[PDB]
Amino acid sequence: DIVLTQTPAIMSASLGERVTMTCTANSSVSSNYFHWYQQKPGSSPKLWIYSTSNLASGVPTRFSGSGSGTSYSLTLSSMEAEDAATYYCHQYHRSPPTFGSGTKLKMKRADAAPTVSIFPPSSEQLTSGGASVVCFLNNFYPKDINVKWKIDGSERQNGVLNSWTDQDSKDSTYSMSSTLTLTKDEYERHNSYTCEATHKTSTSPIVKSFNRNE
Amino acid sequence: EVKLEESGPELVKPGASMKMSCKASGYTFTSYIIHWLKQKPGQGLEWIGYINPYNDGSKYNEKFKGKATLTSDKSSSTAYMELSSLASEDSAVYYCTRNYGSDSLDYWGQGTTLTVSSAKTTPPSVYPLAPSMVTLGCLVKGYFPEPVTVTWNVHTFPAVLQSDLYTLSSSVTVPSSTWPSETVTCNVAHPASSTKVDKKIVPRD
Ligand SMILES: *[C@@H]1O[C@H](CO)[C@@H](O)[C@H](O)[C@H]1NC(C)=O
Numbered sequence: 001d002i003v004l005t006q007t008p009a010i011m012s013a014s015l016g017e018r019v020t021m022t023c024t025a026n027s028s029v030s031s032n033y034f035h036w037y038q039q040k041p042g043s044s045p046k047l048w049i050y051s052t053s054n055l056a057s058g059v060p061t062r063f064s065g066s067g068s069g070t071s072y073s074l075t076l077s078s079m080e081a082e083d084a085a086t087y088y089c090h091q092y093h094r095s096p097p098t099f100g101s102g103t104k105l106k107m108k109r110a111d112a113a114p115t116v117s118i119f120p121p122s123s124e125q126l127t128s129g130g131a132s133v134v135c136f137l138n139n140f141y142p143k144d145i146n147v148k149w150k151i152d153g154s155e156r157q158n159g160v161l162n163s164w165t166d167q168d169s170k171d172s173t174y175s176m177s178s179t180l181t182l183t184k185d186e187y188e189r190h191n192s193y194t195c196e197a198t199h200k201t202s203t204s205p206i207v208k209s210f211n212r213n214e
Numbered sequence: 215e216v217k218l219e220e221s222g223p224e225l226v227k228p229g230a231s232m233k234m235s236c237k238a239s240g241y242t243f244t245s246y247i248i249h250w251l252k253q254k255p256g257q258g259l260e261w262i263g264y265i266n267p268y269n270d271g272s273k274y275n276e277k278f279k280g281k282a283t284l285t286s287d288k289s290s291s292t293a294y295m296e297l298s299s300l301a302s303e304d305s306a307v308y309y310c311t312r313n314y315g316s317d318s319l320d321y322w323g324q325g326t327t328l329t330v331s332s333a334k335t336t337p338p339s340v341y342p343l344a345p346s347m348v349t350l351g352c353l354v355k356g357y358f359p360e361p362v363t364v365t366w367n368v369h370t371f372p373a374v375l376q377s378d379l380y381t382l383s384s385s386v387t388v389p390s391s392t393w394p395s396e397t398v399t400c401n402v403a404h405p406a407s408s409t410k411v412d413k414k415i416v417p418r419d
Contacts, residue, residue, distance in 0.1 A: 088259065098261065177371040
């Protein structure tokens, strides 16, 4: 089980940037049996480069591959958004064949502020004794973002589930969902619920609230 | 055209076994080896073994030679992987893929997600998220296992597991003149419980 070490583990690139990523082996591997794969989230790997430098069918010519012995690389001459993916190296010089832990290539793009929306518990949910407040933070960049929940102006940290989308295929932004779940009893004992997003695009937080009076 | 069609996602209890399938089409089944690989979320690929359907010979990673059994049926051009004595750590996406020139892996199945857990299969509770462009959504709560599909009539967020139940949400952005004059409905399917929900987005009060 020949160890393959890919670097960088994570990297970003703007449209047009040249990208090179490396795969280093702990033992020598024949170039004929060294291959690369591309994988996007939720889908299967596809063969990308085979036998070090041959492009798989449908792979655009801006890709190339190179190497021998213990050092291999994949090169992207000009980054496009469809190229954001994880790339994996593969050796079949020895059984068991092994693969790298991947270089995750992301798209860099202009900063963008999140569009924030807040939603109270549905009466359906309340009927069953639960109360979830939901906040969506849509189409922002960069990924780094701090959502805070406040109840009558006091921070709540417990009972919050946050989920991020992967970079959008078209605009390369992220979106995020934040769900604060309380008991119906706890929820009905306060008036205002506030979702606050801090993001580098504003010195002030983007804030949405509702009150149980409207 | 070559295609490898894998069987659906399965939830299995720890201690049990399961067998998944990989139906091949578009080439001579016996002329190519099929490999099987495991990929846990966030991680790279780990090779399990391969099947040669010509002579029924399979070859294993030493790590899996106990747990995994690779078979094939020539008549239906289907390869199968059985995993036994399952535990949490077997939860992963499993791929079959065809061996091509110089043992490159040229065609891949779509993956079979295996979940190993003691948790109860549970259908979702679906809740409407109601307040020029207006954002609506729906909260899909209290279900197990993955996956759920959400369809409207869009951002759909990956599910988050807590206390063996998943929470997922989906947001939709329409113009003001559409809602609430029109019906807006999020359609949730949870194939593991064979359930669906047609939830109308109703205004409050
Ligand atoms: C592989 O090489 C790295 C880097 O030189 C080393 O630290 C690591 O322990 C090696 N792994 C094995 C299994 O020999």
